[PDB]
Amino acid sequence: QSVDQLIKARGKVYFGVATDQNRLTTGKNAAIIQADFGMVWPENSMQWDATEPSQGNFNFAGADYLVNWAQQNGKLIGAGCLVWHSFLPSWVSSITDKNTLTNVMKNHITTLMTRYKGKIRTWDVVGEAFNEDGSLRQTVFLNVIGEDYIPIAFQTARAADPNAKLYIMDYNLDSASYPKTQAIVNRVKQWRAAGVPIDGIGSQTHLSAGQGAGVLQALPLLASAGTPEVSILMLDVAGASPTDYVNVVNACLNVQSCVGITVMGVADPDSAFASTTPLLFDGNFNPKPAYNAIVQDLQQ
């Protein structure tokens, strides 16, 4: 049974998954995505180091394949991350002029978003901008441009494709008493009051065993920032306990503005954390107990 169809029946937009070309051509990934998921994200093919490995010169072969596949199969598309220190090529992190880096960042955003204009439901514009104590992470963008880089990125993105929902995303937003959770709420409220077009907060939900329960309180706190949408993305859970997965799903159902959930991958062996077997399908592409528990939870 399709978790995407069932979550849509409960009033949400999608249950999605991250993938890319060589997953769609191997294993049983394409068949599972076709049957069970409503939205696809590029795992790597839209990141900066994959799309702009040298200045002004873009690589789109991998991203084009995924966008075309999604359109042919009637799936929604999410994409990202436009500005994320973890996937920056060296040529960007060696720029020291504020004007130059601003133009480089705007060109990167505008080029990617224009190519797929109108085809992408959600863009992750800025990722992992916060330290664990809630201060802003001292990346090349903060050091060279200053805190204005976040407003600039979102303004540029809105102009490039007004149809897309624009998100900021971060991890370790899984507990309501963790300082980073309240910090992103504080800053997003301030940015939206200044007219910055942040449509969503995406919570990168990479969980250890037993941490699902905390999301029931953290996700409503994230929603208190007043963005139109929030989402769970990059979801995986060490051990893949049904209890942890059901708690995350119910957090989504309890938060009106939470539009859906994206899991990090299909089958355990293709996880970056494969030894923790943290996904919903096993190494033989069989649905795991957590998958069936989600199905039952969505039907009750």
Residue numbers in the entry: 4 to 303
Task: Paste lines from the article.
HG3.17 was evolved from HG3, a higher-activity mutant (S265T) of the in silico design HG2 that was engineered post-design to reduce the active-site conformational heterogeneity observed by molecular dynamics analysis of HG25.
To test this hypothesis, we generated a variant of HG3 that contains all HG3.17 mutations found within 7.5 Å of 6NT, with the exception of N47E, which we omitted to favor the formation of a unit cell similar to that of HG3. We also included the second-shell W275A and R276F mutations found to widen the active site entrance. This yielded HG4, a variant of HG3 containing 8 mutations. Kinetic analysis of HG4 revealed that its catalytic efficiency is >700-fold higher than that of HG3, and equivalent to that of the average natural enzyme (~105 M−1 s−1). In HG3.17 and HG4 however, only Trp44 adopts a non-productive conformation in the unbound state, with an occupancy of 62% or 26%, respectively. f Cut-away view of the active site shows that its entrance (top) becomes widened during evolution, as indicated by an increasing bottleneck radius (reported as the average radius ± s.d. calculated using the highest occupancy conformers from both chain A and B, except for HG3.17, which contains a single chain). Crystallographic analysis of HG4 reveals that mutations proximal to the active site are sufficient to alter the conformational ensemble for the enrichment of catalytically competent sub-states. We expect that the structures reported here, especially those of HG4 and HG3, will be helpful to benchmark these future enzyme design protocols.
